[PDB]
Design an enzyme around this catalytic site. Structure first.
Site, PDB file in Angstrom:
ATOM      1  N   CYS A  18       1.004  -1.145  -0.063  1.00  0.00           N
ATOM      2  CA  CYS A  18      -0.027  -0.188   0.108  1.00  0.00           C
ATOM      3  C   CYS A  18       0.925   1.238   0.000  1.00  0.00           C
ATOM      4  CB  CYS A  18      -0.917   0.051   1.092  1.00  0.00           C
ATOM      5  SG  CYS A  18      -0.174   0.146   2.953  1.00  0.00           S
ATOM      6  N   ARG A  24      -3.783  -0.348   5.079  1.00  0.00           N
ATOM      7  CA  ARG A  24      -4.272  -1.274   4.125  1.00  0.00           C
ATOM      8  C   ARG A  24      -3.401  -2.602   4.239  1.00  0.00           C
ATOM      9  NH1 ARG A  24      -4.898   2.879  -0.592  1.00  0.00           N
ATOM     10  NH2 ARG A  24      -3.278   3.617   0.579  1.00  0.00           N
ATOM     11  N   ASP A 118      -7.669   4.420   0.262  1.00  0.00           N
ATOM     12  CA  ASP A 118      -6.870   4.940   1.486  1.00  0.00           C
ATOM     13  C   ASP A 118      -7.484   5.372   2.624  1.00  0.00           C
ATOM     14  OD1 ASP A 118      -3.687   7.003   1.637  1.00  0.00           O
ATOM     15  OD2 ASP A 118      -4.713   5.387   3.013  1.00  0.00           O
TER      16      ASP A 118
END
Ligand code: NI
Length: 146
Positions: A18, A24, A118
């Protein structure tokens, strides 16, 4: 990329990627780890917060622990150690080709079976919607890899 019992021979190591490597990819890594106990599952960030523990919000959210996680910068050297690379955001693929040209051929999106947003600096509801995405994405990958 496919397609069954063959998949287990082709991919024994997986790099979840990520941006900051504190939201994440940490979650995705842990999800895949208990689904694929035999495989080498790690994580990194294209713009990682190096040495930073997992984000507080990410830690809060099902019931799996982010134990001993630290932010890890993504490098071509690191890509060289993994059969499969899963990125959350499509922009990551483009940033991966830029950092590690040789790795692009072995990188796909986490949740290939749409990209994951995100959640950094967002509400707990955002972390839950994202988590859900990670979990189901992690399940479709677990079956597609044995
Ligand atoms: Ni710092």
């Amino acid at each position: 990329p496919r397609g069954s019992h063959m998949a287990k021979l082709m991919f024994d190591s997986i790099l979840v990627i990520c941006t900051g490597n504190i939201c994440r990819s940490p979650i995705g890594e842990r999800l895949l780890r208990r689904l694929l106990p035999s495989k080498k599952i790690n994580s990194a960030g294209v713009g990682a917060l190096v040495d930073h523990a997992a984000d507080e919000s990410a830690i809060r959210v099902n019931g799996l622990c982010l134990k001993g996680h630290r932010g890890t910068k993504f490098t071509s050297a690191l890509a060289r150690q993994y059969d499969l690379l899963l990125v959350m955001e499509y922009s990551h693929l483009e940033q991966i080709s830029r950092i590690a040209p040789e790795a692009r051929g072995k990188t796909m999106l986490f949740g290939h079976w749409k990209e994951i947003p995100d959640p950094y600096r967002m509400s707990d509801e955002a972390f839950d919607s994202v988590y859900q995405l990670l979990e189901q994405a992690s399940k479709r990958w677990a079956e597609k890899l044995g």
